[PDB]
Design a protein around this ligand. Sequence first.
Ligand code: MN
Length: 276
Amino acid sequence: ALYEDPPDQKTSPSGKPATLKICSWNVDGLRAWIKKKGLDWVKEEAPDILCLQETKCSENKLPAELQELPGLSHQYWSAPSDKEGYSGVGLLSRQAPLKVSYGIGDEEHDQEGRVIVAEFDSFVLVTAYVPNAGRGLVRLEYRQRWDEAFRKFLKGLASRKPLVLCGDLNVAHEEIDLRNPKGNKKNAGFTPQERQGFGELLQAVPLADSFRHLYPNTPYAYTFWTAMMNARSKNVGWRLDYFLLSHSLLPALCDSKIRSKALGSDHCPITLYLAL
DNA sequence: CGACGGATCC
DNA sequence: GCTGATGCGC
DNA sequence: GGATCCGTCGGGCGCATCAGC
Ligand SMILES: [Mn+2]
């Protein structure tokens, strides 16, 4: 029931060494995460690109430590427009992207600081903090509209350039992706509509779930544990955080990691190795 | 959203 | 202008 | 009585505003 992520596979299936290391982390409050030493872990992980979700922090209030990241110089941020203190995403990059945009090209879905798009030479990186359907499923209908628009946006992106989508997609795709599937069939994150949404995304773009592609039969691998129930200590969790890849990037896939041991949030980090 | 308790069936 | 109480969104 | 299925609900974070000093 407890889980230990296998060691880092650093070469591609054809032997090419990894050249790109991307780390994604819902930090449950950027300023608190930094207080709990989250950036010390980042320095030890040394990613080429760091995506952050649920920063809950406007660009004006970003801590100063973020300016002391010598290898993550190019920092892009997005915050909600209506009010402060919820959602928010960041993208920090060792090299400058050719182009950075925000949102998914749809007004209704572009107000809550949820999506950053960074275009590199040979691939485009999207990081996302997917809207929660809420206690009582009060936002379920909205989440279904989000799912369809996100899917159409990413399908268009992937048709122009190979795509990496990372971050908190806020859904456990299959029963293997959470510890309590039958008790959660009507809870945000595991409704049949959200799981069907995820499935259509995989098929329609198409995209491959990098972790599940490499470890199709591995249960108890989670990236989130609720903070109240001290569920983390007993590994009662959900896999909400993903790297989804264009099929053309699969021969470059070296590994997709779940950094279970890294503290600082109610999500743990995930790390992608690509041999580009 | 996991712990809990109630309801239904055996 | 400061702090605690309270509410929102996970 | 136990075993399966479900519906209810308390609890707690990181953040905000604001009413009270
Ligand atoms: Mn969260």
